[PDB]
Target: Antiviral innate immune response receptor RIG-I
Amino acid sequence: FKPRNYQLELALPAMKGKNTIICAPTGCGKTFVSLLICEHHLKKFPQGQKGKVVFFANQIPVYEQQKSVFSKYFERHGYRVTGISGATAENVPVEQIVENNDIIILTPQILVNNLKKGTIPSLSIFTLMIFDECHNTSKQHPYNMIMFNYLDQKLGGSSGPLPQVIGLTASVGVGDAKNTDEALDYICKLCASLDASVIATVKHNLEELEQVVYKPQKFFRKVESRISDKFKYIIAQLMRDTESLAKRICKDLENLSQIQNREFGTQKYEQWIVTVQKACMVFQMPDKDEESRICKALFLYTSHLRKYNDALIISEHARMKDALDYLKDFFSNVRAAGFDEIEQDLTQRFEEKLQELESVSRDPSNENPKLEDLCFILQEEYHLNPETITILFVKTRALVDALKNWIEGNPKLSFLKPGILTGRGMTLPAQKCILDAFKDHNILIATSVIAQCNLVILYEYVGNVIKMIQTRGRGRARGSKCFLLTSNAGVIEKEQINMYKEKMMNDSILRLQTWDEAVFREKILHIQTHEKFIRDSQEKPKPVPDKENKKLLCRKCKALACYTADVRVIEECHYTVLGDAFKECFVSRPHPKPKQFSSFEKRAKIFCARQNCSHDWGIHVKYKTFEIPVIKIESFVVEDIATGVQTLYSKWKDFHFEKIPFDPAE
RNA sequence: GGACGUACGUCG
RNA sequence: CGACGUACGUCC
Ligand SMILES: [Zn+2]
Model:
């Protein structure tokens, strides 16, 4: 209530009737600005004619919040305020929704699918297209697809009333720009992709913005890595033994990847072992009986090496016992879903050194200095103020549980309560109830950002130009810190240049707000034009579909799974097997997180039906009334019967063959 | 199942 | 400048 001067002036160009890229770093400010803009838009229409606005919410929580906010704001107006989503798109057709409501709030993908298949022949039905967080307008984004559908009708000479763009954001972003020239080029490209002429930033009332902006102070706490790593040495010896054992089956193991000398525990060995896996998945022998065992042994060795590398990576950022508990949980999970002579030997090799690793993990002298520095900087702040509701940001999801267990099992800090929050990638109610009780948790160990904190700790975290600003984080301003822990000087340089890029944009927008909107347009129109030109020139024609009958086999077992002639495409994205010989080739299991996506309902998970393979094949759903399995070519190999050469595809779009549509008749 | 984005890393 | 790997997140 009582719109302040800063948020009244920030919405002036949008109310004047211009497409704006309003940039407000507040949470409530953007919401109130959007509400005032929708009010001034739906109130400036004459008698008879009625307006129609759409608020493009990107996330389900943001959509559910904005729908309730709009419903509570426009209650004494007679304005229909509804909303579409992934669960409501089934019934209540979107055409009748838009033709009977004045304020629609839908996650874009719905409008993209509508504009694509059958619905919304043109966006001229809308009169306002408020894009929440327009900075996400990038390559192949749903916002970008909506803007492409808009720019096609705009530049194609189609006479029609085009809707306005009121794109709200908190940071226009810089991307990979090096200088102010490249920053201005990127900002102009974003303006052309959004078809706007004003970038509204608060200039007159700076004190009202600085009162609540949530601008904390940075504090770099770079620490050196561990010197005496006995756990790392033992795991490296185990990895060397595993590689020496795997070399006995595949002679040219070093000649399968073009990667140079690599070190254990780095991100390079992971790519090297993944390349070795993808080069061993095409191993073919004329016996076709020994290959099914050779490829299986190689897959098991590669999986063990990948788990060892993941344990070595977790050990560098967490306790020495957490990386061992990870391997113990992995071995416990794998010791039930099949046990052959190779997996038993690997388990025995691991158990021969588990006893030795337990002593080194329990030894408190081998504690990494990074967690010591973290506890040291946490205690000095919680002693100064025993009310700091801090938030911790890490990179890996497996490190969230590690930091939670570290906070739990530490006698130095007792006043801390774990606030583990990873994301679905968990569920929506689990994500909502954990953020609700945040006024009795003390620390929130999250991995990716209504969170008004006063202390942030980026424990080995790096990202875009800014990974700290919270769009929906208005709250209040009373002094906060942005502590950054790291061990790789590279990251420290990244964070040193990001704060520069910030000022870069601060000068770029200031240089762009001086140009008279005329020339601005005279440029951005040419830019978007060129863009459409590239969209028309760059178009790979559909290659001749290979009309043979090849056989899709297992990924790790090389068993005859199914035939390509039995593959049916449901909706150009899902592929099922319409056969009777394939139903006995897989086993079903209950799904951990069942859900539905606009056409199906995830019921079960289908795995390989072999003796000790148990490879993840795909899901099993019910299309409309009948239940079919949806497989993923990613977990499949493609062997031809004519030539015999095998191929590995990651996505279905890369697979060029006779895509027979799914006929419900058979 | 699929699409999309961001970060890191390897390659020619 | 292109492909590719992984991690994380979002949506349908
Ligand atoms: Zn198999």
Observations:
- The pocket of zinc ion is lined by residues A 554, 557, 559, 608, 610, 613, 615 (CB under 6 Å).
- The two ends of chain A are 61 Å apart (CA to CA).
- Residues 58-60, 85-86, 89, 107-110, 112-113, 136, 142, 267, 270-271, 274-275, 278, 395-397, 422-425, 447-448, 573, 596-599, 650 of chain A lie near RNA strand C (CB under 10 Å from a C1').
- The longest strand of chain A covers residues 602-608.
